[PDB]
Amino acid sequence: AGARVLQFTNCRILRGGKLLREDLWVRGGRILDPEKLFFEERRVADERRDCGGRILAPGFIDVQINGGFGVDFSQATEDVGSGVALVARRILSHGVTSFCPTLVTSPPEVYHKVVPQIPVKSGGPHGAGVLGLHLEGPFISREKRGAHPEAHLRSFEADAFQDLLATYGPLDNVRIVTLAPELGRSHEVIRALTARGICVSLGHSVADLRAAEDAVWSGATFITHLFNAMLPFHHRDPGIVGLLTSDRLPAGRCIFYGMIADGTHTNPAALRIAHRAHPQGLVLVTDAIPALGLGNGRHTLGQQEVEVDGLTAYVAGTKTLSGSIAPMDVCVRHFLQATGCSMESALEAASLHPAQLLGLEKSKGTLDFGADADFVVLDDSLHVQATYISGELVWQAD
Amino acid sequence: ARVLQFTNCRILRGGKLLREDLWVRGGRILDPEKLFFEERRVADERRDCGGRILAPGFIDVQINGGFGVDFSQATEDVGSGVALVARRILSHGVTSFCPTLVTSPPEVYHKVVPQIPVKSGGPHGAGVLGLHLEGPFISREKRGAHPEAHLRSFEADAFQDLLATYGPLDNVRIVTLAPELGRSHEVIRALTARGICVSLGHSVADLRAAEDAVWSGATFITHLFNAMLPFHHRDPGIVGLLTSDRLPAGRCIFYGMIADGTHTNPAALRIAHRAHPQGLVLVTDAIPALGLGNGRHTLGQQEVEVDGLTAYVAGTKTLSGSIAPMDVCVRHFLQATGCSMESALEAASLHPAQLLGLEKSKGTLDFGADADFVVLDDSLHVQATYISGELVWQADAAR
Ligand SMILES: [Zn+2]
Ligand SMILES: [Zn+2]
Numbered sequence: 046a047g048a049r050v051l052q053f054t055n056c057r058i059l060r061g062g063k064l065l066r067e068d069l070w071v072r073g074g075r076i077l078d079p080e081k082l083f084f085e086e087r088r089v090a091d092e093r094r095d096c097g098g099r100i101l102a103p104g105f106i107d108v109q110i111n112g113g114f115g116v117d118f119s120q121a122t123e124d125v126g127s128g129v130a131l132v133a134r135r136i137l138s139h140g141v142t143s144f145c146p147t148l149v150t151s152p153p154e155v156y157h158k159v160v161p162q163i164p165v166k167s168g169g170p171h172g173a174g175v176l177g178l179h180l181e182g183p184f185i186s187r188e189k190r191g192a193h194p195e196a197h198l199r200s201f202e203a204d205a206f207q208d209l210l211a212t213y214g215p216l217d218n219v220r221i222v223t224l225a226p227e228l229g230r231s232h233e234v235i236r237a238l239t240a241r242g243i244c245v246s247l248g249h250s251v252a253d254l255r256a257a258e259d260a261v262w263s264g265a266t267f268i269t270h271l272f273n274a275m276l277p278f279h280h281r282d283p284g285i286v287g288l289l290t291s292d293r294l295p296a297g298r299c300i301f302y303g304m305i306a307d308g309t310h311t312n313p314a315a316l317r318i319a320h321r322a323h324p325q326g327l328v329l330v331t332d333a334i335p336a337l338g339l340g341n342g343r344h345t346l347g348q349q350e351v352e353v354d355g356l357t358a359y360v361a362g363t364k365t366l367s368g369s370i371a372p373m374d375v376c377v378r379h380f381l382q383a384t385g386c387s388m389e390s391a392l393e394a395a396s397l398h399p400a401q402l403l404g405l406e407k408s409k410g411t412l413d414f415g416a417d418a419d420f421v422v423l424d425d426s427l428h429v430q431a432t433y434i435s436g437e438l439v440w441q442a443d
Numbered sequence: 444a445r446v447l448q449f450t451n452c453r454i455l456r457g458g459k460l461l462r463e464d465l466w467v468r469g470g471r472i473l474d475p476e477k478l479f480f481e482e483r484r485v486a487d488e489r490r491d492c493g494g495r496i497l498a499p500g501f502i503d504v505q506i507n508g509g510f511g512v513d514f515s516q517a518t519e520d521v522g523s524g525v526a527l528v529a530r531r532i533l534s535h536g537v538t539s540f541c542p543t544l545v546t547s548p549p550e551v552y553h554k555v556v557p558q559i560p561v562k563s564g565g566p567h568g569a570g571v572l573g574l575h576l577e578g579p580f581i582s583r584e585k586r587g588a589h590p591e592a593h594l595r596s597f598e599a600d601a602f603q604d605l606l607a608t609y610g611p612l613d614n615v616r617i618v619t620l621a622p623e624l625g626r627s628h629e630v631i632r633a634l635t636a637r638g639i640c641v642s643l644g645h646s647v648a649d650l651r652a653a654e655d656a657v658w659s660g661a662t663f664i665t666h667l668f669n670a671m672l673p674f675h676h677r678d679p680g681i682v683g684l685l686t687s688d689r690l691p692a693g694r695c696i697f698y699g700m701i702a703d704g705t706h707t708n709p710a711a712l713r714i715a716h717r718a719h720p721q722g723l724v725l726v727t728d729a730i731p732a733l734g735l736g737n738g739r740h741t742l743g744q745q746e747v748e749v750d751g752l753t754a755y756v757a758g759t760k761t762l763s764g765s766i767a768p769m770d771v772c773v774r775h776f777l778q779a780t781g782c783s784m785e786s787a788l789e790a791a792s793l794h795p796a797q798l799l800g801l802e803k804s805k806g807t808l809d810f811g812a813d814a815d816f817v818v819l820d821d822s823l824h825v826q827a828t829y830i831s832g833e834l835v836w837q838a839d840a841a842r
Binding site: 254272273277278279280281282283286287289290291292310311312313314315317318321322385 | 668708710
């Protein structure tokens with residue numbers, strides 16, 4: 046009640062699935078109902094900001110990003126925190142206001158050192174907020190390891206959740222774990238992780254549909270880059286993609302799924318068929334690697350060497366895709382162009398949906414009253430012109 | 444000239460089940476308001492439907508035979524076999540169909556095609572809308588149950604090669620071919636210029652090849668997912684037509700699906716219906732073993748064995764068509780997709796009518812259309828079948 050009231054005017058705002066010609070009101074970092082404010086507090090805006098007719102949408106949330114701008118999160122470097130901060134800062138210019146630093150399959154000693162150095166952290170002028178870690182691997186399949194090194198894959202059979210605890214170390218900073226559910230004893234691990242509030246995602250897996258459905262019933266709620274590093278859809282063997290159409294899942298519970306809309310990992314047909322089959326679950330992720338923002342050269346991805354050739358990142362010396370160099374705003378615009386969906390659907394896939402996945406939909410991913418005032422200013426092509434966190438301008442184009 | 448009024452019914456009209464009466468006169472659906480312009484404003488007969496559903500009669504555009512009849516055999520009485528099938532499928536809710544012939548030697552087409560002409564429906568059976576010729580101009584890689592020995596190609600003289608194979612095409616309504624065949628573009632233009640629907644099937648065509656064939660005039664896909672490349676995130680193949688933005692504006696690509704519970708799992712029916720609901724066409728793809736069950740049968744030049752309710756080419760695990768009737772397919776599609784009753788009924792009637800340009804006379808309960816319709820309960824069991832406003836089959840007479 047003791048903070049300044051900001052009124053953003055001459056804008057279209059994404060609210061309730063629609064672009065509305067309505068002002069955005071903010072105080073103390075949260076969005077205000079202006080009618081409630083005048084009718085209970087009898088207060089008007091302390092400051093007005095003309096948005097020039099542009100679009101305001103909730104800031105993007107990237108739940109799978111391995112690094113960027115030369116930073117590799119899967120390295121136990123001397124200043125891990127500095128690298129996270131650099132990425133957090135730079136992705137503001139991509140419209141990203143929250144993200145999950147992601148680590149790929151690594152030896153346990155890397156997790157033991159890196160994980161405690163990347164805790165949850167609120168966004169601000171210092172960069173997008175850190176929502177917690179996404180640990181992708183090592184409990185994934187050899188057949189679909191993709192860019193993950195075979196030598197550091199692990200399994201559960203010995204002592205299940207304790208094997209995972211010994212591998213990663215304390216899980217306080219962890220928010221998502223990608224695993225392959227066909228691993229023996231995955232049920233016990235999925236129960237333990239979700240009981241601790243950790244989202245379980247299915248990926249890098251040769252699981253069939255029934256195994257995937259079992260994993261959802263155990264508590265899994267996410268699919269890691271749909272179509273990538275999993276078996277294809279077959280009309281008598283649907284695999285993980287079949288989760289998008291399954292009627293055997295808990296009634297009314299939304300299974301979410303990431304898609305990499307960089308133009309290389311999935312064709313327009315795949316983005317369209319998923320968006321049409323299950324629009325509410327689609328989550329845009331960058332799956333970015335350290336070459337994000339650099340565009341070329343040799344980089345690392347954990348224990349692997351990565352080479353960027355043209356606009357595509359491969360494990361050095363191979364034709365194995367190893368992440369993306371497309372920032373989130375590029376993914377949003379590509380998803381929009383490739384699917385022919387509405388601007389609202391593209392913006393929701395990059396913010397609302399990841400927020401819902403993580404249970405944050407009351408504070409992030411929306412412009413609803415009471416939510417955090419994390420939003421981006423967009424032109425009609427969905428180019429980012431400005432980024433706000435807690436109602437404060439934290440990045441502006443030039 | 445009698446006016447029939449069906450009362451106490453829900454009718455499928457405009458994509459909705461409406462509690463409205465159905466009026467019929469002269470074999471056609473009647474606008475009751477037209478009676479205000481005539482001398483008599485009351486029906487000559489009223490039929491209380493007990494709250495049941497009236498829907499357009501099913502249209503099966505891919506059925507190879509059934510009940511011991513194999514359309515792809517040059518027997519001494521081809522017409523009698525077609526009539527037998529036509530008669531029996533009334534009990535499955537089917538009031539029109541396209542007898543389908545599989546890959547055969549040219550001598551079979553020359554004898555059989557002239558003996559299966561278009562024929563209106565009636566008490567003697569479902570109407571014949573024309574022939575569906577599936578093959579022989581299809582891929583070796585995806586020939587399925589079609590015999591390798593009788594596949595053919597176009598490269599020599601294209602449409603003339605097709606004419607020499609089939610003989611005169613007057614009775615032909617659909618041709619399934621693989622568009623990656625050389626000179627397929629020419630054949631597709633020639634067929635569609637003559638009013639023949641071209642369907643893509645038994646093909647390893649990539650998406651671009653499939654889209655090109657649509658631009659050439661193709662409007663149908665033969666049993667989606669069966670005998671074609673899978674949906675894939677690098678190149679979706681023919682299935683990608685359901686999501687393509689590269690097709691002629693305003694053209695609905697239609698696609699058949701076999702909803703027998705064996706040819707495609709529920710995920711496939713769901714993913715297609717959600718990606719492109721307006722194009723989905725239910726076909727039985729029935730084979731001569733329909734209604735006979737286990738044992739040895741034929742499918743054209745092939746021997747077929749039905750073992751455990753599944754049809755295979757004898758001595759193989761190669762699927763060779765279906766033994767599920769259309770009403771079973773309708774109910775399976777409904778249950779498997781969770782779609783509306785209206786969507787399931789439209790996929791079995793409206794959509795195949797639209798494919799064939801017949802939506803003003805078949806596949807609808809619109810005014811002026813042919814009064815071909817079925818009486819259904821809420822589980823979509825067919826309890827009665829009407830053609831030209833006349834009752835031609837009834838499940839029982841308990842009511
Ligand atoms: Zn991955
Ligand atoms: Zn076929």
